[PDB]
Amino acid sequence: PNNLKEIEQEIEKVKNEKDAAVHAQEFENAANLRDKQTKLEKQYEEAKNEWKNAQNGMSTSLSEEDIAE
Amino acid sequence: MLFGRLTERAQRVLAHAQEEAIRLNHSNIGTEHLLLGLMKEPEGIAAKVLESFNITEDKVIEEVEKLIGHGQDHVGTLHYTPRAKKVIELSMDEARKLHHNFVGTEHILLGLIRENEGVAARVFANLDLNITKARAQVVKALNTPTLDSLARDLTVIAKDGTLDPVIGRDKEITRVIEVLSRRTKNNPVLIGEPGVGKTAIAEGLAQAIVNNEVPETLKDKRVMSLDMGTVGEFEERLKKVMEEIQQAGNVILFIDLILKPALARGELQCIGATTLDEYRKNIEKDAALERRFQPVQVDEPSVVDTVAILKGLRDRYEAHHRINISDEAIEAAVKLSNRYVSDRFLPDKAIDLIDEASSKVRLKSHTTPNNLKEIEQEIEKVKNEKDAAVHAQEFENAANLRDKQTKLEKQYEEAKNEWKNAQNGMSTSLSEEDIAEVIAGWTGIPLTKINETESEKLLSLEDTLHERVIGQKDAVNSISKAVRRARAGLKDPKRPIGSFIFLGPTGVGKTELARALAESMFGDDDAMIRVDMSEFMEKHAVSRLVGAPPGYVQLTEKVRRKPYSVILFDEIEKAHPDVFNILLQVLDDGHLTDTKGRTVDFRNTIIIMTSNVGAQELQDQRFAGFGGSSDGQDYETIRKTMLKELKNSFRPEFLNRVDDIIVFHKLTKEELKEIVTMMVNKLTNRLSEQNINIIVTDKAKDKIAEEGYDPEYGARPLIRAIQKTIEDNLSELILDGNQIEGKKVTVDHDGKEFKYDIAEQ
Amino acid sequence: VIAGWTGIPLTKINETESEKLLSLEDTLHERVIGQKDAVNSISKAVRRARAGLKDPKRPIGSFIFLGP
Amino acid sequence: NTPTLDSLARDLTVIAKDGTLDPVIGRDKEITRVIEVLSRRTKNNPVLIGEPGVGKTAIAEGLAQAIVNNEVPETLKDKRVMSLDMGTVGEFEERLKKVMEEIQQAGN
Ligand SMILES: Nc1ncnc2c1ncn2[C@@H]1O[C@H](COP(=O)(O)OP(=O)(O)O)[C@@H](O)[C@H]1O
């Protein structure tokens, strides 16, 4: 639902940014990025779990409209 | 994988370069703008590399300001120069060389020096810095094996990002995964003609897997393809492979003709790509296989769709050739390639057309314009002379030669620098005219014919037809109005361009008019497929034009290869009735399907049928009275009367589907005079090398016109009369050791025969 | 050299191919006595094609003969 | 410098550099077409097609001639003209696999 998409993208760019710091020996910034990534993943798990939890709230059923299409 | 790899420092470099162009008043961001913004971020690895080289920000500011160049600019559409985009491709490529998944400022400087043509490239060269010196400087500062034996993974390659972004297949990528998520018939088979890009579908799906767009049900699956050429011994290999795939559980097979039980048990999810003809012959007959495959049709993208596809790849080609490509150039390229080339479909044929167009203009504007070649010869000749002087112990003479040669080399660099500075001043954009040149060579069509805008050509069709056809203006007006209505859009697009019936005396211009129409519309005289009903009289004749029926060993093949042509059906009044049934289908449906299932098109064709009926009715009007005729009646009145005879022999249902009916008149003495006039002009241009002008008097023209005068045979004998009279005498003059050379020959009938007055031009 | 390669007569080589056509009528009647109409018709046709009146791509000679 | 390619294949750009053989004259369109194809991005690998006996091998000499003349653009600069010999070619495929490693790395 257009939420875990962008959140996952931020995790990707953060990981690349940390890799650049590691190869450049900029460990001062790398330490901050490591904690930031953990923050992103922590909220990522909660956001995904609540989404699938709400998915079970409603049941997807077919209808003659779908077959008509 | 561009935005996802550029680090924050690299992103700030692009932002700095954008405002550098604003300060310098440039409407396009050049390579030199990247260098200016690069020095404003002294934190990256590249900053350390230049630091060890004692290269400061201000030193390169004045270095680039020597040949910066200044001019006017337009706010908006501040794109990158064709060379600038090549730098980004180079820097990203160098990242994979070092096995880096990120692109930073350390790679921006690495790629800048590899351009070798840009402004920034020369700045580094002037500081005795090359690619090799900076290369090592930054280095120190920094499973189903049997299945894999005869196959190739695809999503692994797509992970690298080297694959071009497949566009326009989104409706089919979703379609394929839709078929997969089914309990039955979960094995889609792509059906289409070869070369339309069926293999490109697999790459698009694998790209979505890497990009994380497929749902969880289609997440983390190894895309695998098996080549048909990899094949007792053959049977042993496949048995081992299928067992391994069953263990993995996420291997998607890709094939292109034992294994039937494997698919019946739901063990494999192969995606075939065989042709329609083979599918109906080897798969359709098998009921078990039929219940396990869902064919998916693969079609050529539309013209408007191809525009978007080419725009996506436009940036990629702008880097390789360093050639600016305009938007209007792309739309012209695809439309013209589809219009004339009809052998490879879109977009695989439009991509190469713009590829050769960019390369062609690249070579012409790259070679030295005879400014450094002359100087190079001067340097070379002095060197050889000086070497010979050394062997002669001419030390004093060699001293003068040394000074001269040094001066020549001094001017050589100056001329090269100013020549390339001027080259960088302008943009080597691509024009649609250049594209028209390449396609013109591919077909031999004159560039003027291709350059026609198709708008005024339709308006002036009446005049153009009169050039090659003389007389019967009523026929010309009716057909010209008919075709311009269909092209204007007033007719159903699926219906053919036009359908007509030609009547009147035989050999009066019926064939010539069709040739003239084909030349004027389609730009070629021989763009006609003449078909005569002489061979089509029996019922079995229908199995000839449509192709051989199954179990056995024409027209559909010809029209498919030339979608833009004029089809002529002579002797339509004498044909098998079953052939008429096919004709009615073509007029309304607008397309046909052969025995092989391939569908031909008729929306770019004009159908003309020649019938011998009604001609005897017309001559009955000519012989109704002794010395009179019915030419003074209204043209529509004659059309109504002839329609009665036309419906007498044919079916009224067929006639109602015909756009218009054309009836040709007779020929008179005055008309025949102008007929020979055209042929004289044609023959004059025939021997254009000799440059000989022939003028025939009116009396001589009338003398030969009546010689071939035969209303029964029309104007057919007229051509033969000229061949036996003027050609025979003229040829003998040339055979006599070129008797006439650039002279003028006048033919005047003196009362007995044609007096061949021999004179000069 | 060419005469000794394929046995071509030297006189034929010396011909300029400009008067052979002029004497075609005499040569044809040497082996085909009579039927003058069949000889003059084809003799006056080859000159037109060789002069360049006909299309160069199309073959010079194209005829169908009738009779026993 | 692809040492294995030099041994298992014949090098022609060196011969063209010395100019010992007669220059190719008359094949102006063929040479200009090949360089045009090599400057393309897609399908930029031309293949010479002709009847056996029109000296297609001699045509390849003209391409190397332009390099020595320094007439080809910067894109074609520094490209050794190497021709494989069928005399040298399991064990058959060992040689081709060994040579292709150096060719890809060199890139010129
Ligand atoms: N400009 C012209 N105007 C009128 N008639 C022409 C013109 N040019 C050629 N023709 C005539 O058109 C005729 C075409 O004959 P054609 O229709 O093929 O005969 P058939 O109908 O028996 O096949 C030629 O014999 C020629 O004399």
Numbering used by the authors:
A (entry chain J): 410 to 478
B (entry chain I): 1 to 142, 159 to 247, 255 to 279, 281, 299 to 594, 601 to 808
C (entry chain H): 479 to 546
D (entry chain H): 159 to 247, 255 to 273
The study reports:
ClpC forms a hexameric ring and threads substrates under ATP consumption through its central channel into the proteolytic chamber of associated ClpP for degradation. ClpC is usually repressed in an inactive resting state, where two ClpC spirals interact via coiled-coil M-domains. Antibacterial peptides and partner proteins trigger ClpC activation by binding to its N-terminal domain (NTD). This study reveals that the NTD stabilizes the resting state through multiple anchoring points to M-domains and ATPase domains.
This finding was important in informing the cryo-EM data analysis and guiding us to classify and refine three distinct maps corresponding to the 10-, 12- and 14-mer at a resolution of around 3.8 Å. The three oligomeric states aligned to each other almost perfectly (CC of 0.89) on the “front side” of the double staircase while they differ in the “back side”, which is open as a cradle in the 10-mer and closed with a seam in the 14-mer. The increased resolution of the 14-mer resting state and the generation of an improved AlphaFold2 model of the S. aureus ClpC monomer allowed us to partially refine the full resting state structure and to precisely position the NTD into the cryo-EM density. Out of the 14 ATP-binding sites at AAA2, 8 are occupied with nucleotides (7 ATPs and 1 ADP). While loaded, the ATPase activity of AAA2 will remain low as the highly-pitched assembly of the ATP pockets prevents allosteric arginine-fingers (R704) from neighboring subunits to access bound nucleotides (average distance 9 Å) and trigger ATP hydrolysis. Each NTD also makes extensive contacts with the MD of the adjacent subunit (MD*), mainly mediated by a patch of hydrophobic and apolar amino acids and one clear salt bridge between conserved residues R9 and E435.
